[PDB]
């Protein structure tokens, strides 16, 4: 997207979201990142929304095909599952590449750095969902390491109700439950996160209260399923 | 188990 | 898809539908058509479902962008609407190309020939939705001509309850109402189609009755909106 | 005004 203005890429990413054209949205936001400037809060969210939609569709398709393949056990189901899997891995590698070149290293404020490290954990987690064997082990450790660094920063630099801090804890708890085979760690993290946020709600405006309690309900929803 | 939906700005 | 077996392309098209991967589904079915053999009833439906989903997403996006553009009247909204429009036209041209090379000319049974001519009318209709000016006139006449040939065959060769005959009449009525500025022709066609189908329902099994009455309700739904 | 949905086999 080298010939398009940064501001035009951002404007077109917003239009693509409205049109539910998420592959386009991700390509526009990749082009915007590759302009080399840091991203604002709104721009980071556009980048994340675009890729979460793209990879979310791929993950849903991979799960459908993997279920059919498991029930079957010609080569067609495996071949097509592998094709979708390779595409999914390519998108994850693209996002991880943007984070490594050079979003994370230039992110000095806690809000941006935690945001990008949470993304890094998420996309390694999506790689882990389809990985098999010892490659899975190193991918899992990469997700854990990214989430842990984000957690350490968020606990030092953000209030317990901050929505990015809450969403990070939610997703790290899912990592523990679904990827790392650590359901007790998942439950403990979700419970502690919820309780510390509850005790801080009194400091918030009406609008911030709505933002934080929406994510707290997601933590509670997981706790209800897990206990 | 649900992660952040994260699919709408 | 020249190196993949016809039967594998069909199997993968069915998997792609289950995975809601409609671009893949359309590419697999295009590859199957290009093997050069005629398509069975089930295969024709897979081809149609694949492309209807692809072009349906493009049409929905084009309408969102066209609405934003109309409300606005920089270049970004127009440029992006044009990009989506060109992609949509490319998919329509691809489908029309498959019909012309060589699905229609080899279709001798009424069921296949009517099916393909209805597709031809539909994809010219989607081209007409985005066309402007005198190009619109010839595109509109191409849609009308395809639908009319399909109608003539269907009335000679199929019972009035046949689901393809009913769906053809439904879509031709939409063409009259939405494209050709002929609402009275649309209403007359929908009413006559519905009434002639109703009088033939007594000949049908329980399963065929369900198939036909589902499309009859769509005709009635349009009549309710139009009168 | 609705045409045949046509999006599920
Ligand atoms: C992981 C993550 C990403 C973004 C947020 S957010 O910016 O505070 N916010 C959450 C709710 C969303 N709906 C309101 C649409 C928008 C983005 C939090 C955690
Ligand atoms: C234009 C058209 C296409 C297909 C048919 S159909 O094969 O009889 N049928 C209609 C209903 C659909 N649902 C049951 C999923 C399947 C396809 C009719 C008209
Ligand atoms: Ca510039
Ligand atoms: Ca062969």
């Amino acid at each position: 997207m080298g010939s398009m203005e940064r501001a035009s890429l951002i404007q077109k990413a917003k239009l693509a979201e409205q049109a539910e054209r998420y592959e386009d949205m991700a390509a526009f936001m990749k082009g915007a990142v590759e302009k080399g400037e840091e991203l604002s809060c709104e721009e980071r969210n556009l980048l994340s929304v675009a890729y979460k939609n793209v990879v979310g569709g791929q993950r849903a398709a991979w799960r459908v095909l993997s279920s059919i393949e498991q029930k079957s056990n010609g080569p067609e189901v495996r071949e097509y599952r592998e094709k979708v899997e390779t595409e999914l891995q390519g998108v994850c590698d693209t996002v991880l590449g943007l984070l490594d070149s050079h979003l994370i290293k230039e992110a000095g404020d806690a809000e941006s750095r935690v945001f990008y490290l949470k993304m890094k954990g998420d996309y390694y987690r999506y790689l882990a969902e389809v990985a098999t064997g010892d490659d899975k082990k190193r991918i899992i450790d990469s997700a854990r390491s990214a989430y842990q660094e984000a957690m350490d920063i968020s606990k030092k630099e953000m209030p317990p109700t901050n929505p990015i801090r809450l969403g990070l804890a939610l997703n790290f708890s899912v990592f523990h439950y679904e990827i790392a085979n650590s359901p007790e760690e998942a439950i403990s993290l979700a419970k502690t996160t919820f309780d510390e946020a509850m005790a801080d709600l009194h400091t918030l405006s009406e609008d911030s209260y709505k933002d934080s309690t929406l994510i707290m309900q997601l933590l509670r929803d997981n706790l209800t399923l897990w206990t | 188990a649900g992660s952040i939906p994260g699919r709408r700005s």
Side-chain angles (χ1 to χ4, degrees), chain A residues 1-70 72-110 112-133 136-155 157-190 192-209 211-219 221-224 226-227, chain B residues 1-7 9:
Chain A
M1 293 279 171
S3 66
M4 194 177 318
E5 287 279 15
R6 189 188 191 276
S8 297
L9 291 165
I10 297 295
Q11 176 174 354
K12 291 181 183 177
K14 293 172 184 175
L15 294 171
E17 184 180 15
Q18 288 183 84
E20 298 181 29
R21 295 266 298 196
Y22 295 105
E23 295 180 33
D24 285 354
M25 187 194 187
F28 292 137
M29 287 312 304
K30 178 176 187 287
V33 169
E34 291 170 347
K35 299 298 174 180
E37 305 269 23
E38 296 189 27
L39 305 193
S40 71
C41 178
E42 184 180 4
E43 295 162 355
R44 292 194 290 277
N45 276 310
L46 291 169
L47 175 70
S48 179
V49 164
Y51 279 108
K52 204 135 271 193
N53 274 280
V54 172
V55 83
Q58 296 171 317
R59 292 164 73 208
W62 184 93
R63 292 192 294 267
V64 165
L65 300 171
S66 186
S67 177
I68 296 168
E69 185 181 13
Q70 282 163 335
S72 76
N73 303 330
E76 287 86 357
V77 183
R78 172 187 60 77
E79 288 173 346
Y80 188 43
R81 190 267 302 155
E82 286 173 326
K83 172 191 175 175
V84 172
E85 182 172 302
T86 299
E87 192 188 289
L88 182 161
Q89 294 167 322
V91 173
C92 292
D93 290 344
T94 292
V95 175
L96 292 168
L98 296 173
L99 296 168
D100 199 48
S101 302
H102 299 276
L103 288 169
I104 290 170
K105 71 172 59 65
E106 295 300 330
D109 292 355
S112 52
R113 193 171 183 85
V114 171
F115 192 96
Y116 292 135
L117 287 168
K118 178 186 168 179
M119 302 192 45
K120 183 175 180 174
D122 286 343
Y123 287 88
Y124 275 116
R125 171 163 58 88
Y126 306 149
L127 289 175
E129 289 179 338
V130 307
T132 43
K136 199 182 172 112
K137 285 196 184 158
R138 265 183 285 266
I139 294 167
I140 287 174
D141 203 59
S142 288
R144 185 190 312 272
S145 186
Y147 283 135
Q148 188 58 245
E149 181 176 350
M151 288 282 332
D152 293 346
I153 297 167
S154 75
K155 282 214 262 193
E157 306 293 342
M158 291 166 154
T161 47
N162 177 283
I164 304 292
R165 179 170 168 181
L166 290 175
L168 165 65
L170 176 73
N171 284 10
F172 197 16
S173 77
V174 170
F175 168 84
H176 286 308
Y177 195 93
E178 289 186 1
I179 308 291
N181 194 35
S182 304
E184 286 173 338
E185 186 72 15
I187 291 161
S188 175
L189 176 56
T192 291
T193 301
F194 181 97
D195 289 346
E196 286 158 31
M198 169 142 303
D200 188 60
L201 289 174
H202 70 92
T203 66
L204 301 182
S205 68
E206 169 194 349
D207 285 354
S208 292
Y209 182 89
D211 291 340
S212 298
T213 55
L214 295 170
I215 305 167
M216 290 162 70
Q217 181 64 56
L218 301 177
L219 290 160
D221 288 341
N222 280 341
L223 286 167
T224 293
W226 296 340
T227 63
Chain B
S3 61
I4 288 265
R7 289 167 82 174
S9 77

